[PDB]
RNA sequence: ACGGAAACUUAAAACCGUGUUGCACUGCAACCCGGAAUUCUUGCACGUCG
């Protein structure tokens, strides 16, 4: 299980960033990089916002 | 001392005067600046309480 290694605030929480583009962006077009906005596979489901209540 | 010997066919005079290369005539009739392209794909108002 991967950790959040670092002493300063710049490198405490940063492993939520560099791991979020490792096994999560695998759509794999032959002309675009994986590690950006296009090649995501987490764009599968499409959330609809909840209605208004009392 | 040859019907011989002398003599300019000569002087002047404007081929000039009147007269539009002119009058009628569309550079005109017909046409689309017209057809096919997602403003898009990654993203939690939250860490923080002796």
JSON list of C-alpha atoms (C1' of nucleotides) in Angstrom, two decimals:
[
{"chain": "A", "resi": 1, "resn": "UNK", "atom": "CA", "xyz": [0.00, 0.00, 0.00]},
{"chain": "A", "resi": 2, "resn": "UNK", "atom": "CA", "xyz": [1.45, 3.29, -1.21]},
{"chain": "A", "resi": 3, "resn": "UNK", "atom": "CA", "xyz": [2.23, 6.10, 1.22]},
{"chain": "A", "resi": 4, "resn": "UNK", "atom": "CA", "xyz": [2.48, 9.90, 1.24]},
{"chain": "A", "resi": 5, "resn": "UNK", "atom": "CA", "xyz": [6.23, 10.35, 1.84]},
{"chain": "A", "resi": 6, "resn": "UNK", "atom": "CA", "xyz": [7.72, 13.75, 2.60]},
{"chain": "A", "resi": 7, "resn": "UNK", "atom": "CA", "xyz": [8.74, 16.21, 5.31]},
{"chain": "A", "resi": 8, "resn": "UNK", "atom": "CA", "xyz": [7.46, 19.57, 4.03]},
{"chain": "A", "resi": 9, "resn": "UNK", "atom": "CA", "xyz": [3.92, 20.54, 3.01]},
{"chain": "A", "resi": 10, "resn": "UNK", "atom": "CA", "xyz": [4.98, 20.64, -0.67]},
{"chain": "A", "resi": 11, "resn": "UNK", "atom": "CA", "xyz": [5.74, 16.90, -0.46]},
{"chain": "A", "resi": 12, "resn": "UNK", "atom": "CA", "xyz": [3.35, 15.59, 2.19]},
{"chain": "A", "resi": 13, "resn": "UNK", "atom": "CA", "xyz": [0.21, 15.23, 0.09]},
{"chain": "A", "resi": 14, "resn": "UNK", "atom": "CA", "xyz": [1.68, 15.12, -3.44]},
{"chain": "A", "resi": 15, "resn": "UNK", "atom": "CA", "xyz": [1.24, 11.36, -3.93]},
{"chain": "A", "resi": 16, "resn": "UNK", "atom": "CA", "xyz": [-2.46, 11.97, -4.54]},
{"chain": "A", "resi": 17, "resn": "UNK", "atom": "CA", "xyz": [-1.38, 13.81, -7.70]},
{"chain": "A", "resi": 18, "resn": "UNK", "atom": "CA", "xyz": [1.33, 11.66, -9.30]},
{"chain": "A", "resi": 19, "resn": "UNK", "atom": "CA", "xyz": [-0.55, 8.42, -8.62]},
{"chain": "A", "resi": 20, "resn": "UNK", "atom": "CA", "xyz": [-3.86, 9.73, -10.00]},
{"chain": "A", "resi": 21, "resn": "UNK", "atom": "CA", "xyz": [-2.49, 9.69, -13.57]},
{"chain": "A", "resi": 22, "resn": "UNK", "atom": "CA", "xyz": [-0.72, 6.31, -13.39]},
{"chain": "A", "resi": 23, "resn": "UNK", "atom": "CA", "xyz": [-3.41, 3.58, -13.51]},
{"chain": "A", "resi": 24, "resn": "UNK", "atom": "CA", "xyz": [-6.41, 5.85, -14.15]},
{"chain": "A", "resi": 25, "resn": "UNK", "atom": "CA", "xyz": [-5.73, 7.42, -17.58]},
{"chain": "A", "resi": 26, "resn": "UNK", "atom": "CA", "xyz": [-5.64, 4.44, -19.96]},
{"chain": "A", "resi": 27, "resn": "UNK", "atom": "CA", "xyz": [-8.00, 5.28, -22.83]},
{"chain": "A", "resi": 28, "resn": "UNK", "atom": "CA", "xyz": [-4.95, 5.05, -25.06]},
{"chain": "A", "resi": 29, "resn": "UNK", "atom": "CA", "xyz": [-5.42, 6.95, -28.29]},
{"chain": "A", "resi": 30, "resn": "UNK", "atom": "CA", "xyz": [-2.41, 6.64, -30.63]},
{"chain": "A", "resi": 31, "resn": "UNK", "atom": "CA", "xyz": [-2.20, 10.47, -30.86]},
{"chain": "A", "resi": 32, "resn": "UNK", "atom": "CA", "xyz": [-2.53, 11.99, -27.33]},
{"chain": "A", "resi": 33, "resn": "UNK", "atom": "CA", "xyz": [-0.55, 11.44, -24.12]},
{"chain": "A", "resi": 34, "resn": "UNK", "atom": "CA", "xyz": [-2.20, 9.49, -21.26]},
{"chain": "A", "resi": 35, "resn": "UNK", "atom": "CA", "xyz": [-1.34, 11.85, -18.41]},
{"chain": "A", "resi": 36, "resn": "UNK", "atom": "CA", "xyz": [-3.78, 14.67, -19.21]},
{"chain": "A", "resi": 37, "resn": "UNK", "atom": "CA", "xyz": [-7.49, 15.49, -19.59]},
{"chain": "A", "resi": 38, "resn": "UNK", "atom": "CA", "xyz": [-8.23, 13.41, -22.69]},
{"chain": "A", "resi": 39, "resn": "UNK", "atom": "CA", "xyz": [-7.22, 9.80, -21.99]},
{"chain": "A", "resi": 40, "resn": "UNK", "atom": "CA", "xyz": [-9.25, 9.34, -18.78]},
{"chain": "A", "resi": 41, "resn": "UNK", "atom": "CA", "xyz": [-11.24, 6.17, -18.18]},
{"chain": "A", "resi": 42, "resn": "UNK", "atom": "CA", "xyz": [-12.93, 7.64, -15.08]},
{"chain": "A", "resi": 43, "resn": "UNK", "atom": "CA", "xyz": [-15.18, 9.62, -17.46]},
{"chain": "A", "resi": 44, "resn": "UNK", "atom": "CA", "xyz": [-17.30, 6.47, -17.93]},
{"chain": "A", "resi": 45, "resn": "UNK", "atom": "CA", "xyz": [-20.20, 7.19, -15.59]},
{"chain": "A", "resi": 46, "resn": "UNK", "atom": "CA", "xyz": [-22.13, 10.47, -15.88]},
{"chain": "A", "resi": 47, "resn": "UNK", "atom": "CA", "xyz": [-23.37, 11.95, -12.60]},
{"chain": "A", "resi": 48, "resn": "UNK", "atom": "CA", "xyz": [-26.66, 13.85, -12.54]},
{"chain": "A", "resi": 49, "resn": "UNK", "atom": "CA", "xyz": [-27.16, 16.47, -9.82]},
{"chain": "A", "resi": 50, "resn": "UNK", "atom": "CA", "xyz": [-29.83, 15.92, -7.15]},
{"chain": "A", "resi": 51, "resn": "UNK", "atom": "CA", "xyz": [-33.19, 17.77, -7.16]},
{"chain": "A", "resi": 52, "resn": "UNK", "atom": "CA", "xyz": [-34.41, 20.46, -4.78]},
{"chain": "A", "resi": 53, "resn": "UNK", "atom": "CA", "xyz": [-36.03, 19.53, -1.47]},
{"chain": "A", "resi": 54, "resn": "UNK", "atom": "CA", "xyz": [-38.05, 21.18, 1.30]},
{"chain": "B", "resi": 1, "resn": "A", "atom": "C1'", "xyz": [31.22, 96.82, -149.60]},
{"chain": "B", "resi": 2, "resn": "C", "atom": "C1'", "xyz": [24.71, 90.70, -147.74]},
{"chain": "B", "resi": 3, "resn": "G", "atom": "C1'", "xyz": [17.70, 94.25, -148.15]},
{"chain": "B", "resi": 4, "resn": "G", "atom": "C1'", "xyz": [22.27, 94.80, -144.87]},
{"chain": "B", "resi": 5, "resn": "A", "atom": "C1'", "xyz": [23.27, 97.19, -139.52]},
{"chain": "B", "resi": 6, "resn": "A", "atom": "C1'", "xyz": [20.21, 97.95, -134.44]},
{"chain": "B", "resi": 7, "resn": "A", "atom": "C1'", "xyz": [15.96, 95.91, -131.39]},
{"chain": "B", "resi": 8, "resn": "C", "atom": "C1'", "xyz": [12.94, 91.64, -124.95]},
{"chain": "B", "resi": 9, "resn": "U", "atom": "C1'", "xyz": [7.19, 89.01, -127.49]},
{"chain": "B", "resi": 10, "resn": "U", "atom": "C1'", "xyz": [7.39, 92.77, -122.91]},
{"chain": "B", "resi": 11, "resn": "A", "atom": "C1'", "xyz": [4.66, 95.37, -118.64]},
{"chain": "B", "resi": 12, "resn": "A", "atom": "C1'", "xyz": [0.97, 94.53, -114.76]},
{"chain": "B", "resi": 13, "resn": "A", "atom": "C1'", "xyz": [-3.73, 90.62, -112.28]},
{"chain": "B", "resi": 14, "resn": "A", "atom": "C1'", "xyz": [-4.41, 85.79, -105.64]},
{"chain": "B", "resi": 15, "resn": "C", "atom": "C1'", "xyz": [-8.00, 79.92, -108.78]},
{"chain": "B", "resi": 16, "resn": "C", "atom": "C1'", "xyz": [-10.03, 82.77, -105.33]},
{"chain": "B", "resi": 17, "resn": "G", "atom": "C1'", "xyz": [-15.08, 83.64, -102.35]},
{"chain": "B", "resi": 18, "resn": "U", "atom": "C1'", "xyz": [-19.81, 80.38, -99.37]},
{"chain": "B", "resi": 19, "resn": "G", "atom": "C1'", "xyz": [-19.53, 74.98, -96.51]},
{"chain": "B", "resi": 20, "resn": "U", "atom": "C1'", "xyz": [-19.56, 71.18, -89.05]},
{"chain": "B", "resi": 21, "resn": "U", "atom": "C1'", "xyz": [-17.68, 64.10, -91.15]},
{"chain": "B", "resi": 22, "resn": "G", "atom": "C1'", "xyz": [-23.15, 65.76, -89.06]},
{"chain": "B", "resi": 23, "resn": "C", "atom": "C1'", "xyz": [-27.88, 63.35, -87.32]},
{"chain": "B", "resi": 24, "resn": "A", "atom": "C1'", "xyz": [-31.13, 58.14, -84.73]},
{"chain": "B", "resi": 25, "resn": "C", "atom": "C1'", "xyz": [-28.09, 54.04, -80.80]},
{"chain": "B", "resi": 26, "resn": "U", "atom": "C1'", "xyz": [-28.31, 51.38, -72.42]},
{"chain": "B", "resi": 27, "resn": "G", "atom": "C1'", "xyz": [-22.06, 47.72, -72.29]},
{"chain": "B", "resi": 28, "resn": "C", "atom": "C1'", "xyz": [-27.09, 45.17, -71.70]},
{"chain": "B", "resi": 29, "resn": "A", "atom": "C1'", "xyz": [-29.80, 39.96, -70.27]},
{"chain": "B", "resi": 30, "resn": "A", "atom": "C1'", "xyz": [-28.90, 35.38, -66.49]},
{"chain": "B", "resi": 31, "resn": "C", "atom": "C1'", "xyz": [-26.40, 33.67, -61.66]},
{"chain": "B", "resi": 32, "resn": "C", "atom": "C1'", "xyz": [-27.24, 32.81, -53.08]},
{"chain": "B", "resi": 33, "resn": "C", "atom": "C1'", "xyz": [-20.13, 33.73, -51.10]},
{"chain": "B", "resi": 34, "resn": "G", "atom": "C1'", "xyz": [-22.90, 28.67, -50.75]},
{"chain": "B", "resi": 35, "resn": "G", "atom": "C1'", "xyz": [-21.71, 23.96, -48.65]},
{"chain": "B", "resi": 36, "resn": "A", "atom": "C1'", "xyz": [-20.14, 19.37, -43.61]},
{"chain": "B", "resi": 37, "resn": "A", "atom": "C1'", "xyz": [-16.67, 20.79, -37.31]},
{"chain": "B", "resi": 38, "resn": "U", "atom": "C1'", "xyz": [-19.65, 20.04, -29.45]},
{"chain": "B", "resi": 39, "resn": "U", "atom": "C1'", "xyz": [-16.53, 25.25, -26.37]},
{"chain": "B", "resi": 40, "resn": "C", "atom": "C1'", "xyz": [-14.79, 20.93, -25.38]},
{"chain": "B", "resi": 41, "resn": "U", "atom": "C1'", "xyz": [-12.62, 16.47, -22.04]},
{"chain": "B", "resi": 42, "resn": "U", "atom": "C1'", "xyz": [-9.03, 15.93, -15.57]},
{"chain": "B", "resi": 43, "resn": "G", "atom": "C1'", "xyz": [-11.29, 18.51, -11.06]},
{"chain": "B", "resi": 44, "resn": "C", "atom": "C1'", "xyz": [-15.43, 17.11, -3.74]},
{"chain": "B", "resi": 45, "resn": "A", "atom": "C1'", "xyz": [-15.27, 24.12, -0.24]},
{"chain": "B", "resi": 46, "resn": "C", "atom": "C1'", "xyz": [-12.19, 21.95, 2.30]},
{"chain": "B", "resi": 47, "resn": "G", "atom": "C1'", "xyz": [-8.02, 20.79, 5.71]},
{"chain": "B", "resi": 48, "resn": "U", "atom": "C1'", "xyz": [-7.87, 23.03, 11.43]},
{"chain": "B", "resi": 49, "resn": "C", "atom": "C1'", "xyz": [-10.32, 22.46, 17.85]},
{"chain": "B", "resi": 50, "resn": "G", "atom": "C1'", "xyz": [-5.62, 22.32, 24.64]}
]
